[PDB]
Design brief:
Layout (H helix, E strand, L loop, with lengths): L12 H17 L3 H4 L3 H12 L19 H4 L8 H13 L5 H15 L32 H9 L5 H8 L6 E2 L1 H4 L3 E2 L10 H8 L2 E5 L5 E5 L4 E2 L1 H8 L1 H12 L1 H17 L17 H4 L2
Antiparallel strand pairs: 1-2, 3-4, 4-5
Helix pairs in contact: 1-6, 3-6, 8-12, 8-13, 10-12, 11-12, 12-13
The structure holds protoporphyrin IX containing FE.
């Protein structure tokens, strides 16, 4: 499969900046969701899940075709809970009917990160909606009950190397697990709707205890009320991941720089960009615009 990026006919930077401003203003207004964490974490989780279905060997899945709108992908067990992010964005899609699905789903994640004080993520437009029969089968997103070898191997299908996997994983500063969605329960940190290197400082500084939860799954619990999944705890069990973890715990700016580069790559996998295509857009925040 080749998936060539096609700009939505007639639109420039200012059109997309309006869609960003619409999403960001609604993040600000609907601040009560999930005990006042707000919708920003479930929106960066949605953008990673529509992207993480990619397979580098046959170019199927990935963010291009906006296939999450289809039933098979929408009802994937691993996607439980993302329907709230979908419903958040649906009024915005009626307001800007010209944006493709894959571009709206992916721009939600970018807007969420930047509005939660994160790095600027360069974004590119041009995803095109593809038919229901291009919807990837369920089962391509990662399990949480596994080790660092599973993780390295999983991420190689999206050709992410070790540095990109540890940078990406730090999105755990945002949000929390929810027992009814995943069988896991609790946050990774205390400031869970501000983007910081907190995930790394908690993994290195807390006294973690392995326990089973009410769903009979294991997770690492700390006295502070935080949690870590088996796949998260893996990052300090592996010698190669652990040195990168320490690097981000001592330098949030290196973490912001690497997260930025890796998250754009995750959102662009499986998409060819012609070089007549626009350069990647760096969107201004509400705050930079005085809004
Ligand atoms: C091996 C990798 C990963 C696994 C096993 C994994 C697993 C999970 C699980 C089980 C949840 C909780 C779902 C719920 O109950 O609501 C979760 C949440 C989340 N994940 Fe990951 N994750 C992985 C990678 C990533 C990556 C690469 C990102 C982002 C770049 C990410 C971002 C998030 C965010 C922000 C949440 C919180 C969502 C919320 O608050 O509702 N995850 N993840």
């Amino acid at each position: 499969l080749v998936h060539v990026a096609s700009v939505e006919k007639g639109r420039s930077y200012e059109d997309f900046q309006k869609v960003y401003n619409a999403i960001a203003l609604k993040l600000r207004e609907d601040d009560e969701y999930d005990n006042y964490i707000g919708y920003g974490p479930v929106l960066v989780r949605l953008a990673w899940h529509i992207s993480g279905t990619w397979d580098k060997h046959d170019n199927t899945g990935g963010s291009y075709g906006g296939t999450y709108r289809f039933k098979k992908e929408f009802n994937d067990p691993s996607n439980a809970g993302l329907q709230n992010g979908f419903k958040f964005l649906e009024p915005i899609h009626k307001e800007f009917p010209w944006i493709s699905s894959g571009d709206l789903f992916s721009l939600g994640g970018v807007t969420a990160v930047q509005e939660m004080q994160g790095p600027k993520i360069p974004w590119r437009c041009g995803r095109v909606d593809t038919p229901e029969d291009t919807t990837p089968d369920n089962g391509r997103l990662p399990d949480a009950d596994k080790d660092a070898g599973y993780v390295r191997t999983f991420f190689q299908r999206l050709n992410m190397n070790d540095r990109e996997v540890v940078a990406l994983m730090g999105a755990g500063a945002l949000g929390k697990t929810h027992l009814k969605n995943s069988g896991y329960e609790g946050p990774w940190g205390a400031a869970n709707n501000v983007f910081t290197n907190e995930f790394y400082l908690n993994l290195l500084n807390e006294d973690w205890k392995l326990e089973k939860n009410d769903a009979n799954n294991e997770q690492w619990d700390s006295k502070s009320g935080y949690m870590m999944l088996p796949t998260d705890y893996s990052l300090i069990q592996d010698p190669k991941y652990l040195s990168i973890v320490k690097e981000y715990a001592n330098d949030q700016d290196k973490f912001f720089k690497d997260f930025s580069k890796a998250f754009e790559k995750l959102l662009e996998n499986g998409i060819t960009f012609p070089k007549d295509a626009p350069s990647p857009f760096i969107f201004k925040t509400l705050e930079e615009q005085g809004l």
